[PDB]
Design a protein around this ligand. Structure first.
Ligand SMILES: *[C@@H]1O[C@H](CO)[C@@H](O)[C@H](O)[C@H]1NC(C)=O
Ligand SMILES: *[C@@H]1O[C@H](CO)[C@@H](O)[C@H](O)[C@H]1NC(C)=O
Lengths: 104, 206, 119, 231
């Protein structure tokens, strides 16, 4: 049982600056996954297995994390990047993060 | 370095249907190395299953089967008949064969695959609840029930601590259970266990 | 290219039952797990349960064990979900996902479009 | 055909103190072949730790700082012993010993592994009655007489280390009996566990005992509690 907490809930990031999305855990988790859900769309997979990059994703989406603290990084912020980001992990059963909104 | 990644971190298999397990070789080549297989059915007891070329363990030639594919670059272990004894976590080991100046011949392993087993379907059967105790500690024995669902209680239970019953699979396929409770008073009392519809009592069955 | 077809939406009466069906295509159905995820408006995602194809007694969430029942049909190549004893607040969006296995390490790589169920 | 045996199935030691792990080769002297050691940190794959050969070279791998867990081999008792220096939280792991055995057929060898030790490090342990405390459960009246089978219960409690080994075997035969058990649950300070065994009519007229293997047993020997025979 791992509690995943994402802070802050809503974060403001102006266009053009690389910003980092952070997911925190109560315990140690081996591999963590990141999902992007846009406005009125099913979640997609961006970064799978702690900073491996999923197929079809622009290369400017990269993750960084180790041990308990994990993070997701965007090199270039664009208009199309507005979505809600969740962090997921497997510890014999899934556990989703709170979710953070990214706005331009 | 060399990495072996198992296909599944957990995979349930049922009794009587063959299953396969694959460990992926994200390395130079699967053909060059020698592939082993290990099982840990007990808490920590490692059990050799299959070395690369047709040399199995004690009594594993019949139950298990191993093979190596080159195009997919994997290592396939096939269970021919799963069972409760076959239930365990399996490990894939890679023999380095040594190099021109290297003769350590260590083993590079992968993470285990917790292979849980589940019984085949059989008609439901009644559990014969039997109360038995020694002093202030009582543990009624429901013995031969097939269904998984069960609701429990102890009559006139004044115990400080309540213990969760343990559900295990008998070799006959019908689950066994034990529910235990230590009373600070009124130790002399029977146990009642409700299974399927309505109630079953150790009283009038004794 | 993997498709996980899932219906649009469903509307049912309070106290009724709903059967949600997710159809998989493209990939080998037998190998990969399937999970069901519930999403609400103004939510934090919850995992309801998961089922390996050709298995029995699938794992369930402690908050959905009594109300959810997952079954699969290898011949149909579909995953079914049954929800019963529903309430007023059990109106949400339920997705079906496929678990990548080798190096993905059980990441829900392909998702369904989801069903919006309201009562 | 000699099988590795490690006398300790668990090891609890004070933090930042030396811990010694040993495994003995059964019936076979090691002679030319080398003895290996492996380590399984929780939630990780097992990795080769050290190796000692007939010449005496002590092999290692990447990382593994020198001066840590020297390995020594005793040909007098065919015993290979590994001692951990300055044990720590990262040192908390499971240790196995292995060795290549040559088959009768030429060119084929099998790596046989030991049962494992499961090194455990915790806080300042107190030695006040950490040994398992048993409780004999006699089969109830009108149970074996009417079912033609017997059931026992080896209740156990108050043992600090996580892992405990319980198996059943009759006094006259060395082979073990197929036993069923329930996993331990957390209690006020320590753990408890019970195991039940079923005996057929043939074993009904025998006196059974419950064998429990634990690191903190009295006098370092397996505890024995006798169940009076059904007869
Ligand atoms: C079975 O259970 C139902 C309620 O769950 C009850 O109404 C019914 O009487 C039971 N059947 C019998 C034969 O008692
Ligand atoms: C352990 O603590 C619990 C809760 O404080 C208590 O109920 C129990 O009796 C204690 N165990 C003892 C005193 O052996």
């Amino acid at each position: 049982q791992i509690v995943l907490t994402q802070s802050p809930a809503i974060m403001s990031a102006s266009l053009g600056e690389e910003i980092t999305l952070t997911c925190s855990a109560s315990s140690r988790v081996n591999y963590m996954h990141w999902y992007q859900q846009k406005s009125g769309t099913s979640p997609k997979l961006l970064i799978y297995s702690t900073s491996n990059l999923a197929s079809g994703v622009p290369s400017r989406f990269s993750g960084s994390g180790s041990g308990t603290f994990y993070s997701l990084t965007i090199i270039s912020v664009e208009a199309e990047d507005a979505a809600d980001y969740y962090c997921h992990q497997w510890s014999s059963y899934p556990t989703f993060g709170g979710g953070t909104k990214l706005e331009i | 370095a060399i990495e072996l990644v198992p296909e599944h971190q957990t995979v349930p298999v049922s009794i009587g249907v063959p299953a396969t397990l694959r460990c992926s070789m994200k390395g130079e080549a699967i053909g060059n190395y020698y592939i082993n297989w290990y099982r840990k059915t007990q808490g920590n007891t490692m059990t050799f299953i299959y070395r690369e070329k047709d040399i199995y363990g004690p009594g594993f030639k019949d139950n298990f089967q191993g093979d190596i594919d080159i195009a997919k670059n994997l290592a396939v272990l096939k269970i021919l008949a799963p069972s409760e004894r076959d239930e365990g976590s399996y490990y894939c080991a890679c023999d380095t064969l040594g190099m021109g100046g290297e003769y350590t011949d260590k083993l590079i392993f992968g993470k285990g695959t917790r292979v849980t087993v589940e019984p085949r379907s059989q008609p439901h059967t009644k559990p014969s609840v039997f109360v038995m105790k020694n002093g202030t500690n009582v543990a009624c024995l429901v013995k031969e029930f097939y269904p998984k669902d069960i609701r429990i209680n102890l009559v006139s239970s004044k115990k400080i601590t309540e213990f969760d019953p343990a559900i295990v699979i008998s070799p006959s396929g019908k689950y066994n259970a034990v529910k235990l409770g230590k009373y600070e008073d009124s130790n002399s009392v029977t146990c009642s266990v409700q299974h399927d519809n309505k109630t079953v009592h150790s009283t009038d069955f004794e | 290219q993997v498709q996980l077809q899932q219906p649009g939406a469903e509307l049912v009466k309070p106290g009724a039952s709903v059967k949600l069906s997710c159809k998989a295509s493209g990939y080998t159905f037998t190998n990969h797990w399937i999970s069901w995820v519930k999403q609400r408006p103004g939510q934090g995602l919850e995992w309801i349960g998961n089922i390996f194809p050709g298995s029995s007694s699938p794992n369930y969430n402690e908050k959905f064990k009594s109300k959810a029942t997952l079954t699969v049909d290898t011949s149909s190549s579909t995953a079914y979900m049954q929800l019963s004893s529903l309430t007023s607040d059990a109106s949400a969006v339920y997705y079906c996902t496929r678990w990548g296995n080798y190096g993905y390490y059980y990441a829900m790589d392909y998702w369904g479009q989801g069903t919006s169920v309201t009562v | 055909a000699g099988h590795l045996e490690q006398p300790q199935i668990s090891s609890t030691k004070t933090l930042s103190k030396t811990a010694r792990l040993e495994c003995v080769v059964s019936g076979i002297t090691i002679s030319a072949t080398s003895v290996y050691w492996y380590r399984e940190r929780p939630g990780e794959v097992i990795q080769f730790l050290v190796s000692i050969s007939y010449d005496g070279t002590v092999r290692k791998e990447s990382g593994i700082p020198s001066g840590k867990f020297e390995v020594d081999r005793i040909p007098e008792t065919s015993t290979s012993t590994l001692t951990i220096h300055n044990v720590e939280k990262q040192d908390i792991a499971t240790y196995y010993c292995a060795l290549w055995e040559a088959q009768q057929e030429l060119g084929k060898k099998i790596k046989v592994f030991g049962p494992g030790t499961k090194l455990i490090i915790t806080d300042k342990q107190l030695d006040a009655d950490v040994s398992p405390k048993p409780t004999i459960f006699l089969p109830s009246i009108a149970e074996t007489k009417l079912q033609k089978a017997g059931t026992y219960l080896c209740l156990l409690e108050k043992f600090f280390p996580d892992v405990i080994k319980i198996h059943w075997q009759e006094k006259k035969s060395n082979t073990i009996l197929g036993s069923q058990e329930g996993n331990t649950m957390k209690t006020n300070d320590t753990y408890m566990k019970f195991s039940w065994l079923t005996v057929p009519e043939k074993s009904l007229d025998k006196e059974h005992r419950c064998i429990v293997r634990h690191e903190n047993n009295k006098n370092g020997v397996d505890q024995e509690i006798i169940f009076p025979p059904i007869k």
